[PDB]
Design a protein around this ligand. Sequence first.
Ligand code: CA
Ligand code: CA
Ligand code: CA
Ligand code: CA
Lengths: 145, 23
Amino acid sequence: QLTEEQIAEFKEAFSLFDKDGDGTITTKELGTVMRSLGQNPTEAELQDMINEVDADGNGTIDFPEFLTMMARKMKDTDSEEEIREAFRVFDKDGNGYISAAELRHVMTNLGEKLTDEEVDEMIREADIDGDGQVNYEEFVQMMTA
Amino acid sequence: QDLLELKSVIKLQAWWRGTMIRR
Ligand SMILES: [Ca+2]
Ligand SMILES: [Ca+2]
Ligand SMILES: [Ca+2]
Ligand SMILES: [Ca+2]
């Protein structure tokens, strides 16, 4: 079941998207996050993304809506191409391994300000074989329902 | 740590892909 700490984790994630902290994610903020990950969505695609999860139809995503759709999405596994694309966002040098520094780099680009300890903690949890890095196979497991 | 912050941004890719229209 959903725990308190998991809720706080999702709340942290919501704050990543909610740049101005006004309690809602707009198409503008979603576009901002996507571009910082190197993706180039259109205005129409951003509207459609939000429409899919905007339960009250008001044009923006609040925390309950964010929590609802994210918890649902975690119960699904995305296609290999979708996962492989996400992996390349992190594996910048393309060597097949996500290092702490590469994770630091993405999180920084997202505007988040993590400590070296916090990043290592993330790597450690995703790491399976214990080499201190995340390969594609481990990345796939992490994203697997 | 359940990596839900990291997992949330990764979920964006498939979320976006599902709405794409070719130019
Ligand atoms: Ca906002
Ligand atoms: Ca809404
Ligand atoms: Ca790498
Ligand atoms: Ca590993």
